[PDB]
């Protein structure tokens, strides 16, 4: 045998020892999953809700911009629908982590918007399109409106993008916790603590509380080190919540005022161009519920021992090898800590 220390005879072979080891693995995984389930479901719920809510906000803002174009500038439709749809598509693509340039979104928006304004509103009556696109930026026809929108939307979209990435990475690490594979020595110690009493012919004897403590503090020496980074993660997320609905929803008013501004100088512009050519409540409740789990990694061995069958009195208990009257007395964790450090730096910088 390689696990069950044979003091007398034994009622179990090597294959039964392997079966007990696999059942020990399954029991540890089930206990960790039961410890992590409440927090996992909380973060999954909130991640799903925030993702759907941001998509709803983007769709509604695109709808409102399209509706205000339909009502106030019918001469710019249906071209207006194309560039508005492209703009808000790129908005959503940026929110969901794709490589999109915010300044380029706004600049392509105004580049597409100016030629149809000139041809349908200012000078009524395809090849000259690029000359108009160049004149848009060369003559600064929209004034400071493009840079105003650029900063207004970049500031909110970056915090939203990093909020979603932080929620997803929290889900990732919490899913990793209950799937943390342990050392072989810990496998054998857990097998001894939970099952090796059956090999000695005992039916209902439980392991000592102190033996459970030494075993758990033995194989969770790495997992407990995650607690500092998890606390910093929680506090940095709290720093970040203290934004994007208001901006995307006022975009239509800002664009309308920019169109008025360009129409204001039409006299000189046409001649020159003719010559030349409940959310805040949700994030607050989320942070207040997330602060209740700041001790998650430090209380984990206590959970494993308090939810495993143990003799708390340390009397007539199993010490891993014999029935006593009184008890005598990294790689995946490294990846978790790496990702936590990364997301914590990213969080703190948006502050």
């Amino acid at each position: 045998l390689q696990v069950c220390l044979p003091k007398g005879p034994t009622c179990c072979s090597r294959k039964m020892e392997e079966k007990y080891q696999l059942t020990a693995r399954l029991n540890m995984e089930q206990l960790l999953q039961s410890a992590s389930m409440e927090l996992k479901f909380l973060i999954i719920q909130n991640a799903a809700v925030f993702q759907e809510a941001f998509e709803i906000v983007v769709r509604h803002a695109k709808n409102y911009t399209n509706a205000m174009f339909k009502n106030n500038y019918p001469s710019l439709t249906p071209q207006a629908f194309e560039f508005v749809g492209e703009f808000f598509t790129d908005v959503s693509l940026y929110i969901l982590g794709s490589d999109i340039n915010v300044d380029d979104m706004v600049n392509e928006l105004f580049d597409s918007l100016f030629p149809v304004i000139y041809t349908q509103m200012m000078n009524p009556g395809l090849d000259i399109n690029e000359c108009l696109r160049g004149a848009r930026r060369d003559l600064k026809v929209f004034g400071s409106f493009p840079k105003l929108i650029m900063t207004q939307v970049s500031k909110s979209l970056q915090v939203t993008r990093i909020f979603l990435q932080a929620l997803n990475l929290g889900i990732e690490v919490i899913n990793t916790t209950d799937h943390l594979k342990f050392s072989k020595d810990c496998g054998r110690m857990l097998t001894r603590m939970w099952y090796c009493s059956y090999c000695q012919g005992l039916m209902m004897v439980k392991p000592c509380g102190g033996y459970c403590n030494v075993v758990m503090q033995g194989c969770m020496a790495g997992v407990v080190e995650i607690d500092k980074y998890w606390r910093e993660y929680i506090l940095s997320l709290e720093e970040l919540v203290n934004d994007m609905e208001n901006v995307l929803l006022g975009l239509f008013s800002t664009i309308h005022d920019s169109i008025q501004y360009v129409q204001k100088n039409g006299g000189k512009l046409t001649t020159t161009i003719g010559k030349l050519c409940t959310l805040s409540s949700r994030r607050r409740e989320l942070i207040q519920k997330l602060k209740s789990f700041i001790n998650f990694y430090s209380a984990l061995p206590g959970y494993i021992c308090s939810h495993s069958p143990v003799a708390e009195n340390d009397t007539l208990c199993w010490n891993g090898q014999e029935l006593v009257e009184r008890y005598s007395q990294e790689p995946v964790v490294s990846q978790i800590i790496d990702k936590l450090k990364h997301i914590n730096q990213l969080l703190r910088t948006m502050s």
Binding site: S98, D99, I100
Partner: protein, 148 residues
């Protein structure tokens, strides 16, 4: 819908006269699937015109020998029913490393009596550096004192 950002732009490479290089191109996400076309120095290349160049189903430009298809600014361009998108042009430059020469014979001692000279040349011509290849490393001439 066609995207502006290319999924993977072709990378500029340095390849010897005999080396083989594959230029990767991943067109942007779009429905329908983007039709990838290769342009050498803003001019399309015909895969059937030369055995050295061929177009792959997964949008890759493979060159076996840097002889039948020399240096240039290769650019990948995706065409769709929506519009066209140009990728970042890769500067592919074919370089020839310097290669010295087989020694010549030792020259006769210029001086009949006393200290003479004997020369031996080693040129950098096998192969001669091309398109900014690294020059030959070391000395080109060998001189020894002789006593006649």
């Amino acid at each position: 819908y066609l995207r502006k950002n290319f999924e993977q732009d072709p990378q500029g490479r340095e390849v010897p006269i005999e080396g083989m290089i594959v230029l990767h191109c991943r067109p942007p996400e779009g429905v329908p699937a983007a039709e990838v076309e290769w342009l050498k120095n803003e001019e399309p290349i015909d895969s059937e015109q030369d055995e050295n160049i061929d177009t792959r189903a997964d949008h890759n430009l493979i060159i076996r020998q840097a002889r039948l298809s020399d240096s240039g600014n290769y650019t990948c361009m995706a065409a769709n029913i929506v519009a066209k998108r140009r990728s970042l042009s890769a500067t592919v430059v074919v370089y020839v490393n310097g290669g010295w020469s087989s020694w010549t014979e030792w020259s006769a001692c210029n001086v009949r009596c006393g200290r003479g000279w004997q020369k031996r040349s080693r040129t950098c011509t096998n192969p001669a550096p091309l398109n900014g290849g690294a020059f030959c490393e070391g000395m080109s001439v060998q001189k020894i004192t002789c006593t006649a």
